[PDB]
Structures are given as structure tokens and as C-alpha cells.
Amino acid sequence: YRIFDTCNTVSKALEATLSFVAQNKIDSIPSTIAVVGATGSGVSTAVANLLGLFYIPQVSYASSSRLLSNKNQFKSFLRTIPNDEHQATAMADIIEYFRWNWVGTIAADDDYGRPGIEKFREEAEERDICIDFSELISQYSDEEEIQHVVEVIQNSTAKVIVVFSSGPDLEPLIKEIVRRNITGKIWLASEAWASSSLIAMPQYFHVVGGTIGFALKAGQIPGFREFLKKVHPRKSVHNGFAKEFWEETFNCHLRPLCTGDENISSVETPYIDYTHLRISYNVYLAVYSIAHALQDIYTCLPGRGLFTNGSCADIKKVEAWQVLKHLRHLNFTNNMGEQVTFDECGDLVGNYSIINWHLSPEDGSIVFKEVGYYNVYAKKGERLFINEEKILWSGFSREVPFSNCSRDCLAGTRKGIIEGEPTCCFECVECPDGEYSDETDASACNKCPDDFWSNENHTSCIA
Amino acid sequence: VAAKDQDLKSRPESVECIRYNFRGFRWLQAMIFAIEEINSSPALLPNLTLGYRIFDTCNTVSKALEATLSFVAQNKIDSLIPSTIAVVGATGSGVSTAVANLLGLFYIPQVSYASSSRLLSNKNQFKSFLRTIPNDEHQATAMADIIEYFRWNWVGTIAADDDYGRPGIEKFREEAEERDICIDFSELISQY
Amino acid sequence: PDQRAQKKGDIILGGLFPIHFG
Ligand SMILES: *[C@@H]1O[C@H](CO)[C@@H](O[C@@H]2O[C@H](CO)[C@@H](O)[C@H](O)[C@H]2NC(C)=O)[C@H](O)[C@H]1NC(C)=O
Ligand SMILES: *[C@@H]1O[C@H](CO)[C@@H](O[C@@H]2O[C@H](CO)[C@@H](O)[C@H](O)[C@H]2NC(C)=O)[C@H](O)[C@H]1NC(C)=O
Ligand SMILES: O=C(O)[C@@H]1Cc2c([nH]c3ccccc23)CN1
Ligand SMILES: O=C(O)[C@@H]1Cc2c([nH]c3ccccc23)CN1
Ligand SMILES: *[C@@H]1O[C@H](CO)[C@@H](O)[C@H](O)[C@H]1NC(C)=O
Ligand SMILES: *[C@@H]1O[C@H](CO)[C@@H](O)[C@H](O)[C@H]1NC(C)=O
Ligand SMILES: [Ca+2]
Ligand SMILES: [Ca+2]
Ligand SMILES: [Ca+2]
Ligand SMILES: [Ca+2]
């Protein structure tokens, strides 16, 4: 392996990719046969533009944008994370489940946030939900833009906000919202920040507590934890990041001079402070998908081959495009016994878990409590299940909040249009005499039949 | 490019380009004419001849990236053949986005002539990108102003599923919803 | 890139991870 740091940046990942394709660049230094990465969808898009040129397979573990499913432009992209379409539809289901129609949307200005928020907008207009504001954010965003977004959130009466963004891209916005103490919003989180340590920090709870977010299906990697604690800046020579990891873990330099004898368990860092391995299991499955493709190459038969006239490539002189081909016809069983089969776009269908941000009674941290799930293997309308008694709204409350633009019109009253406002924003207009309204949120007033007249309250007909 | 979809049964070949574009050839001739007229004018860059290495993109990211790898050869050898000092191109915004990703690594200026996407105005991500075409913010707002001018409120939107159609159609969506213009449908298309 | 995890082998797998947030 040759593993690099991207720093969530296109430039670093592109330098690493140029390192990967050096032999190919000379053709058009070891030969990278496949690449595992990357996390951000813009990063993976830039990397796939280059790796797909040389037909080097690229199996990502976190990039979940739908744009990466276009196999004409991304010829050699696979992923072990599911696509973002189901997640946007799932947030549309969540809003339609708690009976809201007046929500706002915030998205990272990148290939992750924008397509997901666009799919959410389509699903919302399909489910008769009104979107008040649609704001774009980035981690490298000026204070003017963040202040404008905060003003919009304040100038709005939408308690529910849908946020397609990562942790870093959302962080400045959350900082400015906390600094102004904007309490009382209901945050719906995509997978990228629903468990982010940059946002789920205890000093933001009054703003972000009670967040309802999505998580991937946890996996099992037996022995991975003991492997994690075996890290050492000197016992690990291949892992050049181990030195800086140790330095940042123990606040020392190889700052006090380090000892090389500190304990990993002494410090509390996300390195071993995990309860589920979700993206880590995606990395595990990326590596095992590549290995099982290579094994498929290694156990081929002269009459049964994916290539021309059933020919089998030799594993001693295997090329990257052959591993790509064997990754398009891959079907292997996991350690947990599930089958991993990439579709015609290299996407791995997967369930979602719905978590809620609750404060820790003892530690004071933010605990992610599974409150529901989203079953992508079920028909539309029966995919969501949320157990509403496990949800603490805003982190402390028990009452499902109100996020409609206008209060419901009682019986005997109709809906009236406020021009310059969406359809969900209506006023209540008393029915004229002789016309009744026996329902809640009725559009027009119903006329009484012959030999019949409306009540005093205009709710029904009396002879 | 050709419609042949690789099954990877054999070593993938280089794709063949289709539908010769005379307008693109005129654009190339414009570049060559400008360079020649600068090289013949004793009032701009005297005693220096301006060279050029112009390639075909076929409106495709892969061809542009091959050419760009031929543009950053010395630079990428230094990081890991004459040196190109700046790039004129490209036409499509996705093509220009990929080329700008590759060129901003080495801070090679890239002045596009037809890439009007708003996404290429992010100088944090596209450090060395310039454009002689205007951005599409004003154009989307202008379509909104045209729909307002004729007093329509019931319109449909078709966007190209690329770095050009999507940002423009979102900007138009914001402007139209501002002007009480109700969009009925919003479909995404592509040549493939 | 000076910071890099390399181990030699018959078949080399590339890796891309965000060891730094930005
Ligand atoms: C908020 O508005 C929504 C409208 O989308 C209301 O949802 C309706 O609730 C009634 C319950 O009496 C159902 O009969 C309708 O079918 C619902 N409309 C749908 C699902 O489109 C919701 O009740 C409102 N809630 C509050 C608190 O105002
Ligand atoms: C996705 O989630 C659903 C529900 O959480 C899973 O279906 C359940 O499967 C278990 C056994 O695997 C059964 O005991 C439950 O009764 C099922 N619930 C249903 C059908 O509603 C489904 O297997 C998951 N898909 C995966 C893990 O790929
Ligand atoms: O493609 C993207 O941008 C996101 C990045 C991302 C996802 N989940 C994460 C968890 C931690 C850090 C980053 C992520 C989902 N795909
Ligand atoms: O950025 C883009 O994709 C478009 C491409 C483009 C524009 N104008 C053109 C005229 C002819 C051919 C192509 C174009 C505007 N910018
Ligand atoms: C923030 O608002 C909450 C809710 O009103 C309140 O309890 C808390 O004291 C406020 N904190 C500050 C610093 O204003
Ligand atoms: C994958 O293989 C299993 C057997 O191991 C089989 O039951 C399943 O149908 C296969 N799936 C696909 C998509 O071929
Ligand atoms: Ca990344
Ligand atoms: Ca994070
Ligand atoms: Ca309005
Ligand atoms: Ca072009």
C-alpha cells in the first residue's frame, strides 16, 4: 500500500493521485492497481477524473454523491457507502412523518451538499412540503456569508432545518449560531455530520441538542481495536502518520519531549472512542472487495474468463483495468455474512439508522441514541420507522415541535391565500352563511344542500 | 466521443471522437491568429515568440485531462518538454473544472473562453482560473426578468446534468421563486 | 508527500484518507 493524506482538499488528493498514476503517465515507481478513497465527494470526483483516465479502479468508502454514479464520466469509480438519493428521500419521509411542512435547507457548497439538497427539494415538492430558505455553506466561507445565513435562519419561522453538509463545512455556521444562542431549531442531519465530532461537542448542545441524523449500518472488524492500540511511532515504521498521531494524542514532540511509553487509552480521542465502525467498515469492505477481485483473478479457469474468449489475466502481470472488470462482476460474502455486489454504477445499497443527539448524564458529552431506521429494501412509504418516544426534542423536550407556516384552520373556516407567500402559508377565513366547513384545513367552504343552512358556527348543515 | 461502452474484455483503447465541430475549429483558429498577430506586432512582447500546443477536448473530461497531463509534464516531474505558461480553455464547465483542478496544483493560469459556470468562481478551489466569458448569475437572473416581463408565472425548467446546467438552473430557481414564478417541472438531461 | 504509509508488496493499493480536517 501507498497511503496519503488528502486533508479534505482536492490539491493534496490530486498530488497523491499523480503519484498513483506515475507509471501510467510515463506510459501515456510501483504500479498502483487500485485506490481506496476518498471521503469527500468533490475530492473523489477530482480523483476519479484522473484514475478513470488510466482505468485504475477507485473504491471509495465515504463519498456518497449521486454525481459519482455517472459511469460515463466516472468509468472506474465504486463505493461501499450507499448513494445520497435514499437519504434525501428519507429526510423527506421524516418531515412528512412528524407532520411538518415549513422547513429550511442548508447545504455545503460542494458535490455532496448540493445534489443531496436538490433531491430533498424534489421529494419535498412531491410530498407537499414548503421550503422557506435554501442556504449554501463552506468551511472556507467569509463571515459576511455566515452572518447572512444566520440572519436568514432568524428571519424565518421554520424550526426544522435540513443540512446536507460535512462537519468541517458546517462548523463556522454552527459557531456563529451558538455565539448568538439561536435556541429552538430542529436539525435534520445527513450522515456526514450526524456523528461529526466537530459539531457534536457539548458546548453547542443548547443549539444542536436533539439533532435527528442518519448513520450507516455498523459493521464488525474483530481484532481491529487491539490493532488500534498497538500503534507506536517507533514500532510502526510503514505508517508515517503514526508520529504526528502520537504527538497530537499526547501533546508532545518526538511541547514536551515524548516518552514513547504513554498509553493510548489514557487520552480520550475519536481514535478509540467509537461505539460503531461505520466508515471504518466501509474501508474494510473496500479493501476486501479489491482483494476478492484479485482472488477472482487468481482462481480463474481457461474456459471461464471475464475477458476476450474467456481468457484469464495472470495475477503476476495483472493490470488495473482487469481488476476494474472483476470489480464490476464481484459477489463475495462478508465477515458478517452479507453479500457485497456493486450495481451497474458501483453503488452499494444499504440501510440507514436514525440517531438522536442526547446529552450524557454522567460525562456531559453528546450521546447518539438510535431512535429509528430507514429500510431501503422496502417499498416507498414503508421504509421509515421512528420510535418517537426515544426522541428528546431540542435535547430535553418530549413534545413534538411545531414547524408549520400557519396554524390549522378550524372547522367552519377555510384557507385564504397570502400572495407573495408559499401555498403552506394560509390565513383562516370564516365561511359565509349557508356554507359550512366540517373538516380541518379545508380549502373552500362547502355549500349546504337544498332545504338546509349552515349553523351559527358554520360547521355543518341544519334543516 | 464514440458511443462504444467498454466491457473491459480487452485492454481499453483510446476513444474515438465524433461530429467534427467547425465552430470549435474557428475558435482554435482565433487562438492561432491572436498568437500570430502578437508575434508579428512590434508593440507587444518584442523579441519573444509565443508558442502554442493546442489540443482537442471533444467536449470530454478525459481528452482534456490527457492534454493537461501533457501541459504539466515538467511541473509534475518537479513535484514527484517545453513548459506551458498558461492555458486557453476550455469550453465546457465540467471539462474546465477538471482541467483547473489539475492546473491549480502547479499554479498554471487557465483563462477559459466559454466556461460560464459559477462554481469556477471559487478561488479557494480554483486558484489559477480566469475567464473572458461572463458568469451565469446575471443570465439566470435575466431569464427570470424575461419571464417576469411577459407576466408569466407557470414555467418549466430543463437543465443539463453538468457543472453548467445545474448551478444556472438553481440560480434561476431562486430568482423565479423570488418573483412569484411557479416552476412546474425541473428535469435534468444529458447527451448520454 | 513526506507523510505517507508505504509497505511494499506484489500488488500495491493506493489510499486516500483525511488525516487532517483541512
Ligand atoms: C402541519 O401541516 C400538515 C400539512 O402537511 C398537517 O398534516 C396533515 O395532518 C392531518 C391531521 O388531521 C392529516 O389528516 C393530513 O393528511 C395531513 N396532511 C398531509 C399528510 O399532507 C399537520 O397536521 C399540521 N400540523 C400542525 C401541528 O400544524
Ligand atoms: C434493513 O433493515 C430491515 C429492518 O431493520 C431488515 O429487515 C429485518 O431483518 C431481520 C433479520 O435480518 C428481521 O428479524 C426483521 O424482522 C426484519 N425487519 C423487517 C423486514 O421489517 C433488513 O434485513 C435490513 N437490510 C440489510 C441488513 O441489508
Ligand atoms: O461525500 C461526502 O462528502 C460525504 C463525506 C462523509 C460522509 N460521511 C462522513 C463521515 C465523516 C466524515 C466525512 C463523511 C458521507 N459522504
Ligand atoms: O460553461 C459552459 O458549459 C457553457 C458552454 C458554452 C457556453 N456558450 C457556448 C457556445 C458554444 C458552445 C459551448 C458553449 C456558455 N458556457
Ligand atoms: C440561550 O438560550 C437559552 C434558552 O432561552 C437559555 O436557557 C440560555 O440561558 C441562553 N444562554 C445565553 C448565553 O444567552
Ligand atoms: C451473490 O451471490 C449469492 C451467493 O453467494 C447469490 O445468492 C446472490 O443471488 C448473488 N447476487 C447477485 C446480484 O448476483
Ligand atoms: Ca477526503
Ligand atoms: Ca467529521
Ligand atoms: Ca414568497
Ligand atoms: Ca472544451
Q: What is the 3-state secondary structure (H, E, C) of A242-272?
A: HHHHHHHHHCCECCCECCCCCCHHHCCCCCC
d(CA A115, CA A105): 12
* B78 is annotated as contributing to ligand binding: no
Query: Do C1 and A15 contact (CB within 8 A), yes or no?
Result: yes
Name the experimental technique: cryo-EM
Contacts of residue A73, Cβ cutoff 8 Å, sequence gap at least 6: A49, A52, B61, B94
Q: Which helix (H) or strand (E) holds A374?
A: strand A366-374
Query: Do A122 and A147 contact (CB within 8 A), yes or no?
Result: no
DSSP state letter for C3:
S
Taking each helix axis from N to C end, the angle separating B93-103 and A10-20, rounded to the nearest 10 degrees, works out to: 80
Residues of chain A contacting residue B122, judged by C-beta atoms under 8 Å apart = 109
Query: Do A35 and A51 contact (CB within 8 A), yes or no?
Result: yes
A70: contact with B, CB 8 A cutoff: yes
A43: contact with C, CB 8 A cutoff: yes
Question: In whole angstroms, how far apart are CA A133 and each of A16, A158, A182?
Answer: 38, 9, 16
Question: In whole angstroms, how far apart are CA A225 and each of A3, A367, B26?
Answer: 20, 21, 62
Resolution in A: 3.6
| A331 Cβ closer than 6 Å to some ligand 5 atom | no
Question: In whole angstroms, how far apart are CA A79 and each of A14, A62, A341, A345?
Answer: 19, 8, 11, 9
**Residue in A13, A240, A287 closest to C16 by CB:** A13
Phi, psi of B45 (to 5 degrees): 55, 65
Contact A33 C11 (CB under 8 A): yes
d(CA B171, CA B156): 14
Contact A35 C21 (CB under 8 A): no
C-alpha cell at A176: 456563529
Q: Where are the alpha helices (DSSP H) in A28-112?
A: 41-51, 85-97
| A203 Cβ closer than 6 Å to some ligand 5 atom | no
Contacts of residue B123, Cβ cutoff 8 Å, sequence gap at least 6: B129
Contacts of residue B138, Cβ cutoff 8 Å, sequence gap at least 6: none
Q: Where are the alpha helices (DSSP H) in A103-252?
A: 113-126, 143-154, 167-179, 191-194, 205-208, 224-229, 242-250
Q: Determine the number of helices (DSSP H) and then strands (DSSP E) in chain B.
A: 6, 5
From the CA of A53, how far away is ligand 8's center (Å)?
30
Phi, psi of A88 (to 5 degrees): -65, -45
Shortest Cα distance, chain A CAs vs residue B139, angstroms: 20
Contact A14 B124 (CB under 8 A): no
Cα-based angle A28, A29, A32 (whole degrees, multiple of 5): 75
DSSP state letter for A289:
H
A91-126 burial: b if 16+ Cβ within 10 Å, else e:
bbbbbbebebbbbbbbbbbbbbbbbbbbbbbebbee
Q: Is A70 helix (H, G, I), strand (E, B) or coil?
A: coil
Q: Which of A22, A109, A46 is nearest to B99 (CA)?
A: A46
C-alpha cell at A419: 400572495
Contacts of residue A312, Cβ cutoff 8 Å, sequence gap at least 6: A297, A300, A301, A302, A305
- Amino acid at residue number A363: D
Give the bridge partners for B160, in sequence order: B189
- Amino acid at residue number A134: S
d(CA A401, CA A161): 13
Query: Do A167 and A196 contact (CB within 8 A), yes or no?
Result: yes
**Residue in A122, A140, A307 closest to B10 by CB:** A307
Give the bridge partners for A187, in sequence order: A161
d(CA A17, CA A35): 9
From the CA of B25, how far away is ligand 3's center (Å)?
42
